[PDB]
């Protein structure tokens, strides 16, 4: 108790931390997007607590781990209760949680850093980058260490404790298996150690060097562009790492601008020779990306990005004038910014027709079709923005209309459908070689995005002469299916009215949109489609033959199921695979008002499944006992029969649900009815191990204590085999006959020996029950008792020498072995030698005065056991020749065991002797 | 609020069934174990009945928690797709100043639930133009959306409401409302006249149903009130707000004697 | 056993703090320059923990040593008082770690101070000066 008091705080803390982390892990993995962002960005949430979990604070992880490591209570002290082993498992589980939290923090901090880098919010990106770098370094050093030194890490200490436990080897009956999956745990720890050593940092900590000089040599009048008089300008440099994150350098000192707009800056040559991206900030506004520096580039001019903003200016005339001025001054158009973005894409975003008209002159076909790193061609951006003039100009230039995007395969028609602008589509249709439908990653047609777009885009598409309304995707969802799963009835009504749509369309699993509505419980849509439209509601799904009413009933959707059963259009007699009927399925769900309503409508009480199970039986086969009561109040057959004849009480006892049995007994259901096997329900009660039913059935009828089925096995024997103390004590309180045997001849004492409890053994031995009982085969209790290898039962048996005599020998065994008149003790010792258990053999040797009577050497040679033969030759000083003229070497040669023959040859025994 | 509601709800019963199924089921299990334990005839049988009523209370509160609905809306609508200053207006009108930047945000309009305001859009410099035109994608769930506008780091102002099937969003309504509500009289009157000549509706609703008449009453301007009262139908002069205030109530609160008469 | 249970939490805490500080002492020193500033400037970094280690809170440094000196379990009683020498050694270890942690933060705070002083950045320099 004192040791338990000492170890309880740390073990409770480790268990609580582990369970908390697991629950939060599944909870966070099962969240939405905005929910994910809000939870991860909590000012005082789980991220900060997990970072502090490696601090030496009380509530953290490392303090309990190193405390239990240092105190040494994990190593067992001799044999004791399961407390040292349990704290060892707690330590291993906590270490697993520690490494899992390590990975957890890495992945979520990386996701946050990427999510804030893509937007361009560098202030939060820097904080998340620093957090990720610190977490990675700190956790890597805490797990294994920055290098092999005196720190030794933590996993190495855990392995050291594991080897100490292994070499402790206090016991080995099960601990060799226990230490065996401890070796498996050691291998897993070695694997994860190799993984973390091989894992590289996801963050590039080293930062570039800022510019060495700034100048304003170029003559540009200052009001143009984003250059404002009296406005400070700052620059930063970042490494361009495609695989890893790179830190943003500290911003340069404020620089004032007056009468000049285009600055010329000089950058030092980088030692590693990698391109560096340059970020520019005005006051505290949003930072922008102005360009990239190659290793051998000296002068950088940010006029390229200024032209990008010139083409993206919301105003038209001012943007065109500044674009013309910049082009006169001299700025390239091939420059790229942001996500590989192109100046023509910015012109498309702005929608200015003047800059597009100027650019298309003396242009190139590849430039108009040039995509970004995400595959967004200029026509893609034009369709997404929704402008029409730029789209018309692009079509006149003969750009590719069938352009597609990487990863998510979407044509600009898909973008127009998702956004919902009918003008862009009505301007795109004048373009030739356009395809009405396309195959996406899931094969989603543009109509599948139009239904999301709105009613007007659906009207525009359905007005087209060329349209495939019944398009099928890879997943198998027709446009009606995902138009109605979204609960926008008006768009579905617009789709239906324009042209005929196959309502009875099904998925690969024969799933109808009506089934989706029933399973998701939107009753209004189901009523609308059932009333105003015609539909075959009797269609069954491919797996399980489930129907509309089954889907409505499943997952506790009661109103929809009630509406379907109230209507007479859909039938109720429809039978699914497995035979589960609407009554049976309602029983499975256990809803009361649905059953009351369908009984009010009218249905047979005794519906039959494939195996003729009565609904009362399945009501017993449920967690809700009120189903039985309501069915019997409505009127049900108490003695209903199945194909196997199983009664509801029989099934209830087979499962062991106490409440069902209690309510059945309260309602006084007859227990005389049996199944095909003839098994009484008390047999199933013994199987489960319920007692109150035993007293109840004995009170009703005491004859059932010795009732037998076709198996002819008494309930006492089954209860003894099930190893339940209460039932065995009860039947011995009535004291059932011990001479009752089945066809196998099993006796309760055999089962007690199998369990090995000394208490039942001493009751049976005080009862003076015969231990020479034999079945049809002829085996006796003594052989099974010796096979079990239970020493203290044997000691208590030899304590009472009056009941069992060693000199006396069973006559049946003499008949089975006429040549060898072995005694019970002699043949028992020989069998123990045969059992290959050295401990049992030495037990008998200690009990028996002279071990040479059995002749363990010849027997062991017959059985071919190396260890027994070596032990008897060396430590027992058994003569190799033996009393008999036949040497054990002949037996070993006959058996063919290798090591036994080699050892006997080494002993000096000769094979030449006859 | 959203975090604490979701997280506590998961703690009590859980968002889904699992091996833990919340701590309430553990309390029910330990109480059932106490039941299975041996009990005294009368006194701790009374303890048994009081723990039975405790179990009933726990079942009732568990059912209430499962039936308890969420009071917030984590879903966020989509911002504007493209912006353009197509209107021919001169910049020094209203809050539109040279060298200023404007950030827009959108939010779902839920009468019973709280709705998240979207992240502010990229800054847009304004020069030589004042009235912007915003184009909005069609809402997925087809909900009306409130739109908020912020100049630099000043006080954000609600600017309008967008229907599911409206895209051409012109931005003149809140400009007119602030023109009628500006502390100055002559400048406000001139800019109100300019905006009216440009074209703006009168029945626009802001601040729990207030109208240009309410803004004129609170500001105390007389010339714009005289201009409005001509060709004004009496129903809008007695139009109440969500709280129930009328233009004469606002005039009395402001204390401007002229508009009262 | 009761005496050992009484002194187990304080000895375990002082040993954990001591070994953690010894590890971090050469962990921080052998770190690269760019990661050095980032590691020091963590909002809930080790510097704040060392500053809080002087507080009378349980997780801090003083509560164990002050409890040891007040309860007077460091003085051996009778023969074979193994726990007395153990807690005494823990006391000297805690005092040594306390002196070293005092000497520790001064260098980093001074370094941050002048490092920001060279480029201006006086807002952070004032905070480090006060610290």
Numbering used by the authors:
A (entry chain C): 152 to 1065
B (entry chain B): 283 to 543
C (entry chain D): 152 to 282
Could you give the paper's own sentences about this structure?
The potent neurotoxic venom of the black widow spider contains a cocktail of seven phylum-specific latrotoxins (LTXs), but only one, α-LTX, targets vertebrates. This 130 kDa toxin binds to receptors at presynaptic nerve terminals and triggers a massive release of neurotransmitters. Each monomer is composed of an N-terminal four-helix connector domain (CD; residues E21–D115), a central helical bundle domain (HBD; residues S116–K350), a short β-sheet plug domain (PD; residues Q351–D453) and a C-terminal tail of 22 ARs (ARD; residues I454–G1195).
In the second state, the HBDs are moved closer together, forming tight interactions that result in the narrow conformation of the central core. The CD assumes a dramatically different conformation and is completely folded out of its pocket. The four N-terminal CDs are remodeled in an extended coiled-coil needle, whereas the C-terminal domains preserve their overall arrangement. The distal end of the tetrameric coiled-coil needle is formed by the most N-terminal region of the protein (helices α1–α3 in state 1) and might correspond to the transmembrane region of the pore. This domain however is flexible and not resolved in the cryo-EM structure, as might be expected in the absence of a lipid environment or detergents. The particles show characteristic mushroom-like structures resembling the cryo-EM structure of state 2 with the (N-terminal) tip of their needle inserted into the membrane. We, therefore, conclude that the mushroom-like cryo-EM structure of state 2 indeed represents the pore state of α-LTX. During prepore to pore transition, helix α5 separates from the HBD and undergoes a reorientation of almost 180 degrees. This way, it forms an intriguing rigid tetrameric coiled-coil with the α5 helices of the other three monomers. In addition, helix α4 of the CD folds into a continuous helix with α5. In this manner, the coiled-coil elongates, positioning the N-terminal helices α1–α3 of the CD at its lower end to form the transmembrane domain (TMD).
